[PDB]
Structures are given as structure tokens and as C-alpha cells.
């Protein structure tokens, strides 16, 4: 519905009821928004296709303990009754005001037998002054290290258009940890750390529809126009039907002769 597929990992207010779901069929809508605070997912379609084949997602706590540094992020945009933030992410602000951010190094080890999915965020404030208010002065630099992921990055404060009532943007980076691989986040400010790591449950098949859900068919493939229930080998409804069903053709209709070639009297 109003929740997006990626929002089931970060946790906007629209994605509360589907934060820890499990289904063999995932349905996304155009009104579904992936974000409450304005931001974007890097390498977005890969993560969307991963979440489509998740069979639902489980959440496991990371055990990331921060002592002496305030973590209760709050925004006027990602709101229900008061100013708050995402579900599975903690905003690492400064202590009380403009102050030095300690060079935190938090390591999480994937001890499960299935590959974990980890999503973290990078904050780019609406101005350099807002970044110093939130995290402090100095060139912040955050490294994310693993046996397969070693990419690092630098936050870039600057003015942005007012999207969803906020100026700054949080880029949502992600990786996949193998079992008994571990990840290390070394951040010295401007960090949206993960709270609960996401774990794949099984096999699903994600669709992107716009019609209401029914439970009356042994349906096989679905698309934005609905469901294509047919034993016929070819279809001409949608070219992007996902599932095991008839194939798309350019013809309006092909008429396969079952009877003989009749001639009238």
C-alpha cells in the first residue's frame, strides 16, 4: 500500500505494519514511498530485486551500544504524533550541541547461516552550519569494511530543494554479509546507523500492481493491470507480466483453427 518495498528495511511511518512481514507474493503500489526523511537508495533496483525474492524479512538486533553520545534522532517530517525518525535506524547526532564526534568503530558479525542484508545511511545536511550543529566541525569520513564490501564515502553538506519538509538527504547504502563474515562501520559523524539487520526468509515473487487484492484465483502471474489467469500459451495484456504464465505477443488475437476448413452451400 502506502509503504514501499525498501521502506520495510529502513522503517518510515507508512512501513510500520509491514516491517517484519513474510509472504510468497509481495505487492508494491505507486503511492508507496520508500522514505520518510528525504533520501535515496544507491544501486536501488538491485536491492528492490533482492527484497522481491526475500520471502519476507526477519530482523535481528545488532547490539550497537553508544554511550555518552545522543542517539534519539527526530525530524518534523518522519512523524506520527511527535518528531521521530526511522524504525531500524539510529541517527548518531552530537551530545547536546556543536561538539566533536568521536571516531566510533562498531563491528557486527553475521553469525546466522543465511546472508544478512545491512542498510545504513549517510546524512547530507541542508547547510554546513546544520551539519556542525548536528555532528560538529571537521571533514567527516565514514568507512564501511567487510570481506566483500570496502567502499567508503564522505558526507557533503549543501543546500537542497525542500522535499518532504526537509532539506538534507540521507543516502541509503546497503550490503549483504555472508555467514561468519563481519562488517565494520568506522564513522566520525553524520551517520544513520542500522539498528536491526535484515535477513532473508525464503522465496517470493514481487509484483507492482494498482488493483485491489483478491483471494479467489489459483493465479500464476500478476502485473499492474491485475492477474493473467489462462492456460493459453500467449497473452496480449501486459509485456511485463511476472510469473509463470503465457508470453507476450504483438498480435491483438491469433485464432488457432480447431475445426476443418468449412465451405458453405
Amino acid at each position, epitope marked *: 500500500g502506502q509503504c514501499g518495498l525498501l521502506g520495510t528495511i529502513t522503517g518510515p511511518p507508512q512501513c510500520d505494519q509491514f516491517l*517484519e512481514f513474510s509472504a510468497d507474493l509481495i505487492i508494491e503500489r505507486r503511492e508507496g514511498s520508500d522514505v520518510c526523511y528525504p533520501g535515496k537508495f544507491v544501486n536501488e533496483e538491485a536491492l528492490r530485486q533482492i527484497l522481491r525474492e526475500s520471502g519476507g524479512i*526477519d530482523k535481528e*538486533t545488532m547490539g550497537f551500544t553508544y554511550s555518552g553520545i545522543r542517539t534519539n534522532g527526530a525530524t518534523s517530517a518522519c512523524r506520527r504524533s511527535g518528531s521521530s525518525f526511522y524504525a531500524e535506524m539510529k541517527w548518531l547526532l552530537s551530545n547536546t550541541d556543536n561538539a566533536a564526534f568521536p571516531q566510533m568503530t562498531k563491528s557486527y558479525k553475521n553469525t546466522r547461516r543465511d546472508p544478512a542484508l545491512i542498510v545504513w545511511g549517510i546524512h547530507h545536511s541542508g547547510s554546513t552550519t546544520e551539519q556542525t550543529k548536528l555532528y560538529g566541525s571537521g571533514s567527516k569520513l565514514i568507512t564501511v569494511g567487510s570481506s566483500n564490501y570496502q567502499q567508503s564515502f564522505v558526507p557533503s553538506p549543501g543546500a537542497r530543494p525542500q522535499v518532504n519538509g526537509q532539506s538534507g538527504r540521507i543516502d541509503f547504502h546497503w550490503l549483504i554479509l555472508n555467514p561468519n563474515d563481519t562488517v565494520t562501520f568506522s564513522f566520525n559523524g553524520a551517520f544513520i546507523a542500522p539498528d536491526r539487520a535484515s535477513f532473508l526468509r525464503g522465496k517470493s515473487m514481487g509484483i507492482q500492481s494498482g488493483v485491489q487484492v483478491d483471494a479467489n484465483c489459483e493465479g500464476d502471474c500478476y502485473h499492474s493491470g491485475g492477474t493473467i489467469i489462462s492456460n493459453l500459451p500467449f497473452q496480449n495484456i501486459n509485456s511485463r507480466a511476472v510469473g509463470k504464465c503465457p508470453r507476450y505477443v504483438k498480435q491483438e488475437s491469433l485464432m488457432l483453427a480447431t475445426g476443418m476448413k468449412n465451405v458453405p452451400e
Partner: antibody
Amino acid sequence: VQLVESGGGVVQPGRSLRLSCAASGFSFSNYGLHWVRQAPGKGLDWVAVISYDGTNKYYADSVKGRFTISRDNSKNTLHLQMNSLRAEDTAVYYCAKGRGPYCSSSICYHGMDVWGQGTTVTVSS
Amino acid sequence: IVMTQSPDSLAVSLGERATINCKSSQSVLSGSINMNYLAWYQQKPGQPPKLLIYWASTRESGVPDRFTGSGSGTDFTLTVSSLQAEDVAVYYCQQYYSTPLTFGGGTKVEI
């Protein structure tokens, strides 16, 4: 993460008592909080649920209209006020948080990830 | 709603198939999230009961893979593959799909 508790002791039935559960190591204002009891030798019994903002409060049928549950996110503490106690309230009280980020899902009364050490209260008759 | 349990303590030796059953008066599985709301707890004597599995199938990080939870609409099962000296406790099934939160009657295990 862990939660510390205080206020347990021996109190006469029908009196007033204050039961407080302080928390540390996590964002108190985010997770939902639960109050539960464990009778000595019997099974676990739920008492009350408070949400992240405290607007929604749910109580057991045996203590409905009797107790009240309050939290203060500024002081990082959780209170459970005692009024008009009776005999079968002799149990150890736990203030286990709910396993839910900011009252997610279709429920608000989640499970219980970690639990407090527990304070035992016993009435005298 | 009521969370009834299996029969009482079983004199099962180490490494046996430990089966605990929980029976539901209503259906806790909801058609929206399809995650089957139910939690299982183990309680040591003199120690607070820490959660073992959640949503009746999602195993936690602090527990081994021996505790497997099979969930359904009404009937629920924990199977423990092997029993050590650290697995002796009393077990509870708690529903949280609908108020009130009814815990189980308790299923202690005997080695």
C-alpha cells in the same frame, strides 16, 4: 542492554506502593514497554502495556481499572502505580521491553526481548 | 483468548526429540502481515525468562539452532534437537495478536 528495577518489598493489602523501572543502554522513548508478573511456582502473567508515547495503555482483565502505568522519556524511567492490592498479587514483577522499534506492526503490545531482574512483592495477612 | 500448553514435565534424556505443544483458542495469524504472532520464552530457576524465538519462527541470535519453532493457525510446536545441562528451564508460549497477553501454563523439562 538491561533494565534496573526498584520499589519491591512487603506492603499491606489495599495500600499504595510505587514501582519504578529505570532503563539504560538503548533509546527508551522508542521501544514499547511491558509490565508482567511471575507468581512463585506458577506461570507468567501479563500486567500492563504502555506505548512509545504513552497514549495507548492496555491492561489485564484482572487489574483493569486498578493499576496505572506511566513512563517519562526525559528521566528514562517507567512507573507502575499500586492501588488497592489483594492477596494473589504476591509475585515478582518484570518490566521487560517490547520487541518493536517505535510500536510497529498492527499491534503495539509486542513480545519481550530482554527482561529486568525482577522485584518481589508480598502482602502480609 | 487463552494459551493452553502441552502435558507436564517430561523425563526425557539428553539428546532426544523434545516436543512442546501450544494450543490456541483463536487464530493469531493475521492475513495482512502473515507472520503468525507468537513468542516462546524459557525461564531458568531464579533468573528472568529471556525470549528464545519470536513470531513463532524467527530464531534469535542468542540461542542455538536446536530450538526450532513450527507455527500454524492454531497448533504450535517447539522441537529441541539436543538437550544439554543449559537447556533445563520452564517454557511459555505468549500470544500478542490480541489483548490480553496470555502466557502459557508452563512446561518445565527434566533431563
